[PDB]
């Protein structure tokens, strides 16, 4: 879609649907490569798409499992991560056009956010009332754990400064955490 | 014993002739396993490609004899794989449709065993069928699951996903 | 019999050097592994490279 905006008055329409993408399966998540127009869609299969090609340009998939969510990296834009329904996190690299690493968790992760100030570092919203902070290179362990929610965290976001994280949960609360501290400094 | 005797089909195909020749060669080499191999006879063979590009030999067999085959299926299958590399040797009997389909699946997973069977009902309405397999011979079947899905889809016309719990493949 | 034994039976050492192609390490290609075992290694190999790239950001 295209939206007319009042950012600039250097002109003076065509607002509405611009192009549509048909898919064999339902779509559950979408993210866009920042540097280039390419974007990815996560449904039964994770697909790479180009704006100017109506069919999925490339098919990525570790296995038969479906993908629940995805998030491109903001610094190493060629790296992508995805979330599966089998309580798994999968990493991808566009430079290789293949998945890179996978780890299985005790529970599903609903959202994943990459640190804007740390290219190799990301946080994951998990269903055990916990948010897990991970270094990409060594995923055998988490960097930090956040525990102050009482229902499964549904969304997580990095501060664009990279030194705070905010978490949303089914328990009717929003919590903010300092990156180096494991407990929320505030609840909304 | 001539290869044709092992082939129940009146008009043996060439590949049937080669596999029967290998079987009788195993008989002759065997000092006493021949006693079990000699009564055993197979109806037919069917060779199918796989996603990896290799092939799989689905031997069509009678059930009452299929029991005896299963008694000696391990050694016989290993030997035939030696005779026919690049090919997965499998014994399947020829035989309600749900019953026969699950029996074919049991024949496929032999020697290993099915821990379970899962079906996932997606948001869009897509159906993901899966089969949970034991870790008795995990290394070997971890070289063969692609053959298993190819065989099951080719025969039953169904999409299925074999996985092995207790391990992250 | 193996190939080497025949070429030894000549016991000439001038016939031996004529068939130079035969002497050296075996270059027969290994039987391909299953695709997932191959791609699993490919995934592992890719994960090495990606790690090396992001480590540049470490400093």
């Amino acid at each position: 879609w295209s939206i007319n905006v009042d950012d600039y008055s250097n002109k003076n329409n065509e607002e509405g649907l611009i192009r549509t993408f048909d898919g064999e399966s339902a779509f559950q998540g979408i993210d866009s490569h920042r540097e280039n127009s390419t974007f990815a869609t996560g449904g039964a299969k994770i697909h790479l798409w180009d704006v100017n090609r109506l069919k999925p340009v490339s098919d990525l998939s570790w296995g038969a499992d479906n993908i629940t969510s995805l998030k491109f990296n903001q610094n190493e834009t060629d790296i992508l991560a995805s979330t599966g329904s089998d309580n798994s996190i999968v990493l991808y690299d566009l430079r290789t056009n293949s998945p890179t690493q996978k780890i299985v968790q005790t529970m599903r992760t609903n959202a994943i956010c990459w640190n804007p100030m740390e290219a190799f570092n990301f946080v994951t919203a998990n269903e055990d009332h916990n948010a897990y902070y991970y270094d990409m290179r060594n995923l055998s362990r988490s960097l930090n754990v956040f525990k102050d929610h009482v229902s499964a965290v549904m969304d997580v976001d990095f501060s664009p400064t990279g030194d705070e994280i905010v978490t949303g949960s089914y328990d009717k609360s929003i919590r903010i955490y300092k990156t180096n501290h494991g407990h929320s400094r505030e609840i909304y | 014993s001539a290869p044709q005797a092992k082939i129940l089909s009146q008009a043996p195909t060439e590949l049937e002739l080669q596999v029967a020749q290998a079987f009788v060669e195993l008989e002759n080499s065997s000092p006493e396993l021949k006693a079990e191999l000699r009564p055993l006879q197979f109806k037919s063979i069917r060779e199918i490609d796989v996603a990896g590009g290799k092939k799989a030999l689905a031997i069509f067999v009678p059930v009452p004899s299929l029991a005896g085959f299963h008694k000696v299926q391990t050694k016989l299958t290993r030997e035939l794989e030696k005779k026919f590399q690049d090919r997965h040797v499998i014994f399947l009997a020829e035989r309600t449709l749900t019953a026969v389909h699950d029996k074919i699946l049991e024949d496929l997973v032999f020697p290993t065993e099915i821990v379970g069977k899962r079906v996932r009902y997606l948001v869009g309405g897509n159906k993901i069928q899966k089969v949970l397999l034991d870790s008795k011979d995990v290394q070997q079947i971890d070289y063969k699951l692609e053959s298993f899905q190819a065989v099951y889809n080719k025969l039953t016309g169904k999409q299925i996903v074999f996985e092995i719990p207790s391990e992250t493949h | 019999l193996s190939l080497t034994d025949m070429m030894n039976v000549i016991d000439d050492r001038q016939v031996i050097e004529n068939a130079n192609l035969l002497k050296g390490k075996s270059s027969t290609y290994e039987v391909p592994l299953p695709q997932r075992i191959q791609q699993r290694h490919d995934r592992k190999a890719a994960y090495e490279i990606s790690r090396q790239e992001v480590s540049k950001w470490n400093d």
Partner: peptide
């Protein structure tokens, strides 16, 4: 803690590692 008074072999589990069930690539 109570079980630890008698059992000889209970590995202590780092809670940063409890959530992980397994990884494809082992290092």
């Amino acid at each position: 803690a109570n079980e630890r008074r008698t059992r000889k072999d209970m590995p202590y589990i780092s809670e940063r590692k409890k959530q992980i069930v397994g990884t494809v690539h082992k290092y």
